Write a protein that binds this ligand. Sequence first.
Ligand SMILES: [Mg+2]
Ligand SMILES: [Mg+2]
Ligand SMILES: [Mg+2]
Ligand SMILES: [Mg+2]
Ligand SMILES: [Zn+2]
Lengths: 58, 41, 128, 138, 96, 180, 48, 157, 98, 154
Amino acid sequence: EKSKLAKVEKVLGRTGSRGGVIQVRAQFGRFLIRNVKGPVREGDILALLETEREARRL
Amino acid sequence: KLNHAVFIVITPSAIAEKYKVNLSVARAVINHLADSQKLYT
Amino acid sequence: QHILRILNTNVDGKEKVIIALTAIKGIGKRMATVICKQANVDPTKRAGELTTEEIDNIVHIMSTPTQFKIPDWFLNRRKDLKEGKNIHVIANQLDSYLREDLERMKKIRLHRGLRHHWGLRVRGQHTK
Amino acid sequence: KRVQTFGKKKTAVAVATVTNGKGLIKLNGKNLDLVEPYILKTKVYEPLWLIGSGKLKNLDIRIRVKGGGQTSQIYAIRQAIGKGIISYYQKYVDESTKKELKDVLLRYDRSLLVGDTRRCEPKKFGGKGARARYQKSY
Amino acid sequence: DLDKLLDLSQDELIKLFKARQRRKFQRGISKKAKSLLKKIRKSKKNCEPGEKPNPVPTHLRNMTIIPEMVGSIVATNVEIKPEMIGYYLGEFSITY
Amino acid sequence: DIKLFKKWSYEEINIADLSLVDCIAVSQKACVYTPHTAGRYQKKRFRKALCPIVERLVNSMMMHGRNNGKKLKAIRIVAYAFEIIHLMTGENPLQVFVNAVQKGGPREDSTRQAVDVSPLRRVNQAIYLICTGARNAAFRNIKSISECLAEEIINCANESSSSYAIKKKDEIERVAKANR
Amino acid sequence: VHPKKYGQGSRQCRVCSNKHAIIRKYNINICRQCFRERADIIGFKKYR
Amino acid sequence: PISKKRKFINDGVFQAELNEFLARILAEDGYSGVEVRIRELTSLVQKRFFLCAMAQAESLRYKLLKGLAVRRACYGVLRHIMESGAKGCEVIVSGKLRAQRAKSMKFRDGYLISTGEPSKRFVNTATRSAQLKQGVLGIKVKIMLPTSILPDNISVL
Amino acid sequence: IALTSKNLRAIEKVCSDIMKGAKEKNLNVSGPVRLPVKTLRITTRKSPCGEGTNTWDRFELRIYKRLIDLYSQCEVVTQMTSINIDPVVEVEVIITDS
Amino acid sequence: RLLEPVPFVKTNNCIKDVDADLFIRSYATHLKLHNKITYPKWCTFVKTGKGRKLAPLNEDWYFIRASSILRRLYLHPDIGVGFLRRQFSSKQRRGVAPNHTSLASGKILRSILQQLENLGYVEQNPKKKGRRLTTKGENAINNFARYINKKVYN
RNA sequence: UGCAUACUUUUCCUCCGCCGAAAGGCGUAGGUAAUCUUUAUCAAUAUAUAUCGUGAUGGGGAUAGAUUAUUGCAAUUAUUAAUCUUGAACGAGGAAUGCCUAGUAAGCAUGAUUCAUCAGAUUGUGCUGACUACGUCCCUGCCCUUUGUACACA
RNA sequence: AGCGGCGAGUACACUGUACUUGCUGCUUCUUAGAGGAACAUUGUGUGUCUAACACAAGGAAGUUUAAGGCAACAACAGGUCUGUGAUGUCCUUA
Ligand SMILES: [Mg+2]
Ligand SMILES: [Mg+2]
Ligand SMILES: [Mg+2]
Ligand SMILES: [Mg+2]
Ligand SMILES: [Zn+2]
């Protein structure tokens, strides 16, 4: 429920069989490789809830 | 259903909600008070 | 009088006069308005606050409007088939007239009448 | 003395004749008091507000509008005003002031000086619109 | 009345009728209509008060009925009453 | 002086999200007096970020076929809503709107498994949700659209699950949680 | 003989006497298929 | 008195008619012309009024009528075209042709541009339907002329 | 003088020639004014039959009307007009004081 | 209601510098006060144009119409009956078939024009085309506009 | 009512002036067209102010009944149009499936084509101006390399 | 086609504005011919630092600027002889 700010460093690869999702690297200030559903660029800040649990790279 | 009547912080909707009335009647009431969307205090 | 009776079978409840009037089978909207004008009664008032005298007057007006100022071309049922006058027919009377017309058509064995009897269109429409 | 530029949104060319005068500002034969709808009125007045009402007491303005609908017309008028005032300044008033005005306009938004290049794309057969085709049932 | 109508002029009749018919009358009536009328008249003349006269087979369905043609039968066959008047001919061709 | 609706100045407004600030620009050049901009907000990927929030709201309102391409009406409605906000439940309407926006985005969504949501997308969703809810409230009620919309906005600001958008968001969040 | 002056069967294609599908704009009076073939010679160029 | 638009269309129509008339008349001629023994023709026109592709096509048709081995004729035509300085050619002959069913036969020599306004410009095309034994043989000849320069080339000196 | 024609470049050339002729002497010639090109558009449906996704084709016969004025005597204007010319450009001279 | 802080002065001289609807209303009121124009016979039960399928519902609509016509006349040089009709056109819903534009019932307009000419406000010009304003009438209109402006200012 | 003879505007766009509730009519005027219809405005959504007030309701205009016209040699199986009245289904649509990424979707009209008359069609044109991507191969369809084939009418 | 130029007025402002009749330098708008302008130009990334892409500035415009038109080779036993006096055979011909 408590949202934690993660500034996006680099946008890795556009995942999902249908293409809606992106893989993203985000610094709080630790490297957490996460998924995003919608337009995201470098420098934009995510709304992470369940912080310490990552995604699979491409 | 809600058959509102005619014979017996200001906006028409509010009036309708409160005394159970047609909004023409609400409008009339507003006019009286004063004496196409509305706002009154 | 929340609930009223101007003619053979109406309701005419809480609605604003003209629309209440339109409940009758001279349900013209425009016609109703004209009638109101003829009467000289405020159309912003509701059906329940009307006097009985007023109602009577309205009824009278509705019956044979031709002799009143209200014009000729206007009138519901133009020449009345029965070779004579032009008059607004009103209420169940209208229905009766329609029925009579239908019967006449049937008797004639005109195509339209036949169609009506069948329960098909009349208009010229398709419905394929 | 007197300077003639245009605006342009869709089709809707508002030609702004900006002259020396007392500061009235008009459309064909009518004051900008009217325009038409009360909501959009601000889109015409905005450049004036940006530049200041005292700066236009030296400048009369007439605007001839032709073509387009309502909103487009308004936009065109705005554009004309923007081009117009600035053009006047460039010629008959100083350069620094003109530059300042331009900067102000830029800070507010585009569309005042530079034009909206969009225009109605040709309808294509097999449909009603540009892209919108009809319908297949198989 | 019917008899009265029959008695009075063509103009009057036209005025009485509904507008399409009136318009048609104004326009004219063509060469065939006259012939048809004549035929009808002949039939009437030939008639017996007990049973109706011989029919008159007709190709065309356009004719408006006028007090001339009351009492006889025409065209399959259709008898023409005074109740019909300005309601066209027809009554010919369709099934079910 | 720079202003909106010649009434609510948005020099007084505040934000306190960072991410949302980055996403929605109510700025120096995204100043506006009446929502109707003929901006080129969809010729680029992130040019919708420059778009003022009021404009976005208006666009959202504009939806539903028989009411589609009636920008002016939408604008009027939003103005009315703002006025209502100002009057009853007394606060700077812009601030309220901002608060609602902040509230509105589902932070995590489901997919074919749970994933996070970009700020812009969240904002868009919020905008949509608020308008849709308002529309629903309006439809075959009586109330009026502007009033309903205002109410919805207030609810969003509060962060209270009496309105529809908030409820939807909550549901989405729950789903996400369930997923992961 | 019956009125052949105003109707589809009144006039025809100049080219092949067909009563169907006549381009009747500008008094061309060519049935459209024929026009499509002779659009070059008449001076009708497709641009857009 | 007749309007400008109306006039133009009429003129076009007249031109077309003239062309058709010429085609009808001159089966024995290398026809292209359209600019105004011949006396009769003149009279006819008065009554009415008050290297090249078409020629080649006509020739082909004539040959067909006469009764040759077809392929040979086509080859000859191609050769002639080449001699006359054509950068490219193409002939098609589709129809019945020996067998009953089908049978379209291409005959290209030099390169033949098909797409663009260059095609419209720099090719002369012609279409004749030679009536024969049990139907029609369908000529289409297409000649690419000497260019006034093609858009594809970039000639550095 | 009104020059009606179908072919643009040719028309332009003709106009140029007439201008040149004028510039010799004695002619207060107003410049060539090209008029609104009233384009005859025919939208025919391709395909004789009703088969194939009904493609239309917008033909355009775009007539160029051109206009030019002078203060002169008839013979001189006739002479000027004689640039030889051909069947393509349709000429009309108006010799009115008004 | 209308008034606001603007960045210019308004030369309140002619009717083109006045807000329309309000002006029209004022003119109607003036007319009523005068009793200068009648309300013929058929006025009280006619429909203003094919598309309306319903009576006006304004009581003194005729006066309003007249006022509008005056304004129109002022705006344009020479204006007919047809033009007037076109101006007061609306969408006619043909029930199921889609809407068409609907030309107004011209008779009433014509009558109004006639009345105006009788009173000495409009003028059938033998040069040019159909009925423009007469100079006196124009002047009167201008005066009225000025008055309205003054009232608004007050 | 018919023919013959003489003579001249009208056959299409309609200004305008009168009659007509309306449709339309009659009289005349310009236009063989950047001139006139008409275009510094031919439209509707727009917007502003009133009447309604959630009630199959004044939403909705089907179906019907009876006239007044216009077109046409001819209008019934109603050409279309107008006037009065008739007040049906429908409370946002199941299985399925179509179209679409910026002046686009959608809404709103309108010119032209057919046309003696008649758009709910098509085809152009504009006016009001969204949402959402800015990608992916998950489906669907094409294309490619590999692979397998007893198919080649594949 | 306009814009002014200017006479002539009709209304009202200050010490010009709105509107019509009569007469005749400018080309911004109105028309339409010939030219110009964007080439990923300059800036910075990603890329075998290849072909090229992404971002930023400039700019009227940065998805060949947007939209079409044109349409190879080979077919389909696709449609059309009810478009044709393009056209075969068979039928029909008082
Ligand atoms: Mg090529
Ligand atoms: Mg069709
Ligand atoms: Mg599909
Ligand atoms: Mg095999
Ligand atoms: Zn043909």
